Each structure stands twice: as structure tokens, then as C-alpha cells.
Structure 1
Amino acid sequence: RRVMHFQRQKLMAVTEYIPPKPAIHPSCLP
């Protein structure tokens, strides 16, 4: 689990998965 070069770190951070927000919260609506 070695460390990464810093620029590879930034590339991994910027390209991180962002999930699609659900239209409504399930708790307060089916």
C-alpha cells in the first residue's frame, strides 16, 4: 500500500466517483 506521486494523488481525487442525488429522500417518501 505504497504512497503515490502527488500528481497521481490529485488525479485520483478529482476523478473520484460522484453519485447521482436521488430525487427525494426515501425516509420521508417511498
Structure 2
Amino acid sequence: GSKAVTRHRRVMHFQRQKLMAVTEYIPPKPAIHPSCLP
């Protein structure tokens, strides 16, 4: 197979790929955009 360190980005196990997709930064969204407010 392939070593742990590679010159190319190595494809993840699907379980890990799903984990990385769930654990994504979600920025806070204010109820009203600050620009619309005085």
C-alpha cells in the first residue's frame, strides 16, 4: 500500500471522510445582519 506520509493527498477512509464533513466549523449567524441595523 501507501505510507502514512505522501507527496500526494491521500484518500481517506469513507468513515473518516464522513467525520470530517460533520465536524466542520459553523460560524454564528445573527438574526439580523449588522448592516441592516443602525
**Aligned equivalents of 2:35, 2:11: Cα separation in 1:** 40
**Which blocks of at least 5 consecutive residues in structure 1 are unaligned?**
none
Pick aligned residue for 1:12 from 2, 7, 20:
20
Instruction: Give the length in aligned residue pairs.
Output: 30
For structure 2, the 5+ residue unaligned runs are 1-8
Aligned identity (percent) is 100
TM-score scaled to structure 2, two decimals?
0.56
Structure-1-length-normalised TM-score: 0.65
Tell me which protein shows more helix as a share of its residues.
Answer: 1
Q: How much does 1:29 deviate?
A: 4.1
Query: 1:24 Cα deviation (Å)?
Result: 3.3
Moved over 6 A (4+): none
